[PDB]
């Protein structure tokens with residue numbers, strides 16, 4: 320459709336990004352999400368979908384990669400996605416990303432609540448350095 | 450002469466003087482990283498940051514006044 | 515929210531193993547023929563070695 | 574010019590009877606400028622719809638938001654939003670009967686009555702800025718708030734629930750005036766509102782001009798309901814180019830033009846009074862309606878449903894439901910965003926819309942909309958005729974007509990949207 324046609328309607332891009340995030344293929348996810356820039360389409364919802372599907376597919380490490388590279392790019396995730404991703408990271412013990420996401424969440428103006436600091440502390444308590 | 454009133458205006462704008470000055474230092478070091486023109490003669494990166502920020506406040510000051 | 519800068523200093527007595535491990539540029543060591551008490555712990559009151567051993571400092 | 578009395582808005586502009594945006598009287602700005610108000614790149618203009626702020630210069634885009642106005646706190650009026658009543662301009666002397674009256678209000682139901690009490694007292698307090706500013710507030714015959722309406726207007730409103738809520742508001746206000754302006758009150762109260770009309774006017778102004786914010790007064794972070802004598806001249810928009818902001822060091826309300834937005838000479842500077850309220854709420858409180866209201870709703874009960882995502886994409890609407898916006902990528906406007914929020918709709922992970930059954934649903938919902946239009950006795954353009962020519966510019970009546978017209982025009986846009994959606998689904 321790109322090589323012998325016309326710009327795809329948004330659901331085409333969103334569906335193929337979802338197929339990536341639900342299958343894995345996160346590099347293909349980012350490649351196509353970056354290709355969405357050239358359509359001037361809203362990248363927010365597609366990126367949210369990609370992150371959510373990667374988390375649901377337990378592809379957490381590359382989900383962290385795409386999320387942090389989006390947040391450093393200045394995009395704001397939906398509050399449900401911050402809460403879920405922080406909780407799942409802390410269940411995985413990935414405080415190295417949980418704290419960074421918490422800083423990006425604060426920078427996005429979502430002030431960290433007692434839930435988020437409880438999640439961080441759950442992992443911090445493991446270090447033996449009180 | 451006048452530039453310190455702009456400084457005071459921006460000091461009045463920002464909610465923490467130390468955080469403001471930190472943000473100015475950050476802006477200057479990222480400026481001197483995103484651009485590698487020497488930009489070190491009669492005009493200085495600090496004054497440039499102050500100028501651009503007071504221009505965001507809408508005020509007609511040229512780069513480094 | 516806080517940037518959580520954590521750093522700490524520890525002072526402690528050094529093991530003879532660390533003394534062998536010494537080997538602003540460099541450090542060295544003397545092989546003492548006999549053990550020697552640290553004057554800060556024998557002499558400088560209250561005598562810390564005496565406080566461990568429960569011996570009078572005169573002893 | 575730190576004196577004088579009776580400056581006024583030249584009534585040459587409210588002379589539309591025979592059949593547009595002249596400058597406001599320069600004294601209107603001067604009384605602020607002498608008191609450290611500053612307007613940057615904007616001009617007060619006086620239409621028959623009252624004052625507005627319009628950009629007097631092209632303003633280039635800026636990286637941070639750019640200041641367009643500064644109003645100093647000393648010229649404002651404030652009431653605490655929560656029970657422990659305090660006044661931060663502190664106009665009211667300690668132990669003044671006004672404090673007893675204002676306490677007799679419900680903590681959360683009667684904030685408008687409290688603000689009206691403050692407004693009236695600030696017209697009685699000599700050499701308070703509102704002593705001069707009150708001349709530029711709309712008089713009881715030109716205020717749009719339906720608290721000044723009567724059944725002659727509400728019969729034209731044709732919205733019985735909103736008629737009932739307006740009637741309840743008027744009843745509440747008049748009962749409060751009767752209770753607290755009885756003949757036993759001191760002269761220093763009776764002179765504030767010697768008749769019901771003065772009080773219902775004051776309440777209508779307090780309602781239509783109440784801003785509310787979280788603010789910091791020194792150390793105290795607090796919730797205020799407040800009147801700002803030049804930010805209240807901003808007109809509403811659901812796509813505002815400006816927002817209010819607070820500086821606590823010098824207690825300034827900034828009006829800030831949005832970051833990264835260019836604006837044009839003669840563009841109206843507007844703000845989003847209350848985000849996410851249906852047109853009936855804007856009629857209830859402010860006393861106006863707008864057809865592009867992107868949160869309006871329709872009492873659909875159909876089992877016919879449209880593929881929401883396709884409705885978005887056919888109109889290039891983007892974002893989450895709380896976020897829906899339109900871009901450069903041309904009839905699509907806030908009413909189509911309202912349609913996407915309101916039509917009976919279905920969605921599925923990736924499943925495409927049935928091109929036939931979606932046309933069937935379009936036809937069914939279009940005939941539902943047509944019967945909804947048929948529930949009114951007249952079309953939209955009959956009200957357009959009744960507004961392009963009008964008997965006496967009775968402001969409450971014209972506002973009710975604008976309301977009804979807007980609703981019909983809306984449902985019309987719903988029809989047109991479904992038509993263009995089907996055609997553009999190809």
Ligand SMILES: C[S@@+](CC[C@H](N)C(=O)[O-])C[C@H]1O[C@@H](n2cnc3c(N)ncnc32)[C@H](O)[C@@H]1O
Nearest residue numbers: 622623624711717781782805806808809859861
């Ligand atoms: C905050 S008050 C501003 C006072 C108004 N400029 C005046 O002349 O008194 C809002 C008033 O402006 C008018 N208004 C508000 N939003 C409007 C809109 N979107 N279009 C037209 N008029 C509007 C209504 O009459 C409403 O009572």
